């Protein structure tokens, strides 16, 4: 603590008159071998031991225009005192920056030449920042980049540093950190779409992938067992998965990395093949199953308009799912008609075995942990079976269960309108309106209803008669002139008028709020949620089939790779291409 | 009027100049007390900083935050309340204690309204009058303040409850009108919370 | 009249209402028990350990810088 704080101040600011004297001061200090503590003087006085911050990490933490003095201090102690083995691998002591070298801090502050010369001094590029800040809980709390130097050069938009770092012989490209992530995993972890940044991630991800040139990067699974495009699908990033699912290489010697074998193009019409490595539900964790069954991002219609993803769905649906959906509609319609005739006029009991079948079908609702129609299907099934099991008994509490099961079943018939697009967009707006705005209006209307009903019942008819008369006054009925046991009917009169005008202004406020919320949900968002609903029932009907009879996949092995004969036409793109080309 | 220059910047309602005042750092030395954002470490996106609390804190008599919250004649106060030590200070002042104090005041007003509901409907029978006197001397600063409507509804509810009780002591039948109007305005006043 | 007061102006007046009841509930407390202010003297100046993240600004900065 004698004068190492002085050299810390000298590398902080950059006064050279302390530095030139102090470099030979420590030189005559190490030349005078004190002979009571020989090795600990070097390892304790050429660094700090409170936070583990050494001199050059303090200098690169305090980057100023004094690059001459930092070139001097890399060329002062690092090679004369022969310390560089035990020195440049210094890590921290705390939990925030646990295991952080000077390479990532050197490349973090745009000093690529400093980092290239200090790895030319013989550092290690296989550092692993295992701190809990570096592996945070959410994205806001910390920086996640891959805890690797070439991964940090990938995330922080430094192509020249990763160019000089890949050409080093003993760097790793198949390296896996504490989360098991390689460069492509962390590069798509830091990524996002074009709405915020100007797409440097893909614009150097191509450089990483073709500089590597090997397939073994794109199968390295993480601790959750995910291929890099599966992790690209799960975190919700559009354009990087667009680049993955449509990627071709013109020049040869790197042809297995391509995925779009364009066999013939002619004006607007162009046939192509694609891959089915993981974009197909015959594998355990497909891309399509992830990006349909995902629930926490909202932009899934961006990914479901990509080519082998969107195209695959039509084949899976036109092929078999329209007929399977119409068959399920016909079964539910005949079940509801037999329940209608059995309920009205009193194969008399097909409804109970069908209710038991639909109950053990929808009994996975507690095992799944906007799936509301599963709950309505389950409450209809248990209400039908409770009505029948009380019909076996000698009770009169069974007809209430039958009439409520009738009301909920014939309301549940309206679930089957998805498939008619001009009625499905009408259907999902009903769910949007009851979820968002009518519940708030009911929540204010119930407390106004109680605050007037207790008042009018304290004026003395009873409670449940006055609140029923108040609701009949709301819907448009109910006499109001002279009620019994009024002290003074003037106050009853203008209390009633105050209730009616407050209900009117509440209704007006509710209708203009739900007019104010539909500035963009007029046709667009209903259409995206309808297409997502149709994709979810594609996958739900497809996985219910057994392991055989699925001869409904695509073209054979062209090593062994499934493909798709997809003929896309881009008329507007061809017209703009041949118009701007000449 | 005894105002520091950023207090006058807050009172007249100007945004970006107060943004420059509340976030100002000087890179070169010999002028360091004029800075207000001691950036101690930045690393990619994450950057910790310090700020000052010379006047942006309600422990002083005329703070900046008290001025720009209690101002009433300009409309763009949400421009200033998204500035950093101003907006950030509020979360600490609120998550810290004010959610629990607000929920406690809601529970007291809810139990007071439920005891007034049961006392009004079926006829600790008289907690409502001492709570009404407490809320009346609480909201009696409405004439001393000179869009504070809910203070007026709270005051008319308090005086209507105490007028109903002071006529209930008497032998009059003009008291039940005051009780039923106090019931209507109290259960409408629950919607303030 | 609701060409702009659909979600925006209601949100600003709600945040201003919440700030006014922050200050009204805060000034009602007595002179003691307010150990709820911020960090000590660093002459003597109180400070705040504020960790802001500007993700979009950092992305535009490192995108336009190179």
Curated annotation (Swiss-Prot), chain B:
Spans of the ANK repeats are: 1-23, 59-81
Q: Write out the tissue specificity statement of the associated record.
A: Abundantly expressed in CNS. Widely expressed at low levels. Detected in dorsal root ganglion (at protein level). Expressed in the keratinocyte layers of the outer root sheath and, to lesser extent, to the matrix of the hair follicles (at protein level).
Q: Does the keyword Hydrolase apply?
A: no
Q: Which BP terms does GO give this entry?
A: actin filament organization; calcium ion import across plasma membrane; calcium ion transmembrane transport; negative regulation of hair cycle; osmosensory signaling pathway; positive regulation of calcium ion import; response to temperature stimulus
Q: Where is the signal peptide?
A: none
Q: Which cysteines are joined by disulfide bonds?
A: none
Q: Which GO terms describe its molecular function?
A: calcium channel activity; identical protein binding; metal ion binding; sodium channel activity
UniProt topological domain (Extracellular) ranges: 169-173
Its keywords, alphabetically, are: ANK repeat, Calcium, Calcium channel, Calcium transport, Cell membrane, Cytoplasm, Disease variant, Ion channel, Ion transport, Lysosome, Membrane, Metal-binding, Palmoplantar keratoderma, Repeat, Sodium, Transmembrane, Transmembrane helix, Transport
Q: What is its main location?
A: membrane
The reply to whether Cytoplasm figures as a keyword in the UniProt entry is yes
Q: Where in the cell is it found?
A: Cell membrane; Cytoplasm; Lysosome
Membrane spanning stretches: 92-121, 124-146, 148-168, 174-193
Can you list the GO cellular component terms from the UniProt entry?
A: cilium; cytoplasm; lysosome; plasma membrane; receptor complex
Assembly mode: Homotetramer. May convert from a homotetramer to a homopentamer to allow pore dilation. Interacts with TRPV1; may form a heteromeric channel with TRPV1. Interacts with SNX11; this interaction promotes TRPV3 trafficking from the cell membrane to lysosome for degradation.
In the record, the note on similarity to other proteins reads: Belongs to the transient receptor (TC 1.A.4) family. TrpV subfamily. TRPV3 sub-subfamily.
Disease (UniProt): Olmsted syndrome 1: An autosomal dominant, rare congenital disorder characterized by bilateral mutilating palmoplantar keratoderma and periorificial keratotic plaques with severe itching at all lesions. Diffuse alopecia, constriction of digits, and onychodystrophy have also been reported. Infections and squamous cell carcinomas can arise on the keratotic areas. The digital constriction may progress to autoamputation of fingers and toes. Palmoplantar keratoderma, non-epidermolytic, focal 2: A dermatological disorder characterized by non-epidermolytic, abnormal thickening of the skin on the palms and soles. Focal palmoplantar keratoderma consists of localized areas of hyperkeratosis located mainly on pressure points and sites of recurrent friction.
Q: What does this protein do?
A: Non-selective calcium permeant cation channel. It is activated by innocuous (warm) temperatures and shows an increased response at noxious temperatures greater than 39 degrees Celsius. Activation exhibits an outward rectification. The channel pore can dilate to provide permeability to larger cations. May associate with TRPV1 and may modulate its activity. Is a negative regulator of hair growth and cycling: TRPV3-coupled signaling suppresses keratinocyte proliferation in hair follicles and induces apoptosis and premature hair follicle regression (catagen).
The protein depicted here goes by the name Transient receptor potential cation channel subfamily V member 3
The UniProt gene name for this protein comes to: TRPV3
Q: Which residues of the full protein are shown?
A: 340 to 565 of 790
